[PDB]
């Protein structure tokens with residue numbers, strides 16, 4: 001959508017492939033390897 | 049953008065019209081500015097924390 005940022009991703013040389021792509025929030029936001037780079041932030045519900 | 053509905057494209061541009069920045073003024077509450085009346089209560093001739 002207009003005014004939104006696309007899913008953060010990086011292309012890097014790995015296992016002799018020039019463009020092995022990796023992205024944020026993998027495997028999923030609940031089990032993410034680093035929640036810090038994931039745009040989905042775990043939050044407890046506030047009262048009301 | 050605010051929403052995402054394309055209401056119109058008539059006369060839309062990217063000009064930075066606010067080169068002189070959004071104006072600023074200092075908050076001074078000494079005359080009651082920024083305060084509000086408390087519920088259904090009246091306080092007379094007194095100071096309240």
Ligand SMILES: *[C@@H]1O[C@H](CO)[C@@H](O[C@@H]2O[C@H](CO)[C@@H](O)[C@H](O)[C@H]2NC(C)=O)[C@H](O)[C@H]1NC(C)=O
Pocket residue numbers: 054055056057
């Ligand atoms: C936003 O909507 C307007 C129409 O409300 C789109 O403008 C039209 O774009 C097409 C592209 O083929 C032209 O044929 C028309 O002449 C344009 N004007 C009108 C009045 O229809 C516009 O493309 C939309 N998208 C954006 C990003 O502005």
Ligand SMILES: *[C@@H]1O[C@H](CO)[C@@H](O[C@@H]2O[C@H](CO)[C@@H](O)[C@H](O)[C@H]2NC(C)=O)[C@H](O)[C@H]1NC(C)=O
Pocket residue numbers: 093
């Ligand atoms: C509002 O409250 C003030 C402070 O209690 C009152 O001021 C006093 O008034 C008496 C006369 O009635 C004077 O002798 C005192 O010297 C005053 N003190 C001060 C600090 O000014 C005032 O009368 C009250 N006004 C009303 C309408 O209730």
Ligand SMILES: *[C@@H]1O[C@H](CO)[C@@H](O)[C@H](O)[C@H]1NC(C)=O
Pocket residue numbers: 032033034035
């Ligand atoms: C805890 O979580 C972090 C972030 O995913 C991870 O680097 C770390 O290895 C995990 N530690 C354990 C004990 O699971």
Ligand SMILES: *[C@@H]1O[C@H](CO)[C@@H](O)[C@H](O)[C@H]1NC(C)=O
Pocket residue numbers: 039
């Ligand atoms: C989300 O917005 C906050 C400010 O409210 C900002 O600190 C944070 O970096 C933003 N995160 C992303 C992924 O845009």
Ligand SMILES: *[C@@H]1O[C@H](CO)[C@@H](O)[C@H](O)[C@H]1NC(C)=O
Pocket residue numbers: 064066067068069
């Ligand atoms: C608009 O111009 C002012 C003055 O140079 C600058 O501070 C501001 O960052 C500019 N805005 C954008 C979105 O470039």
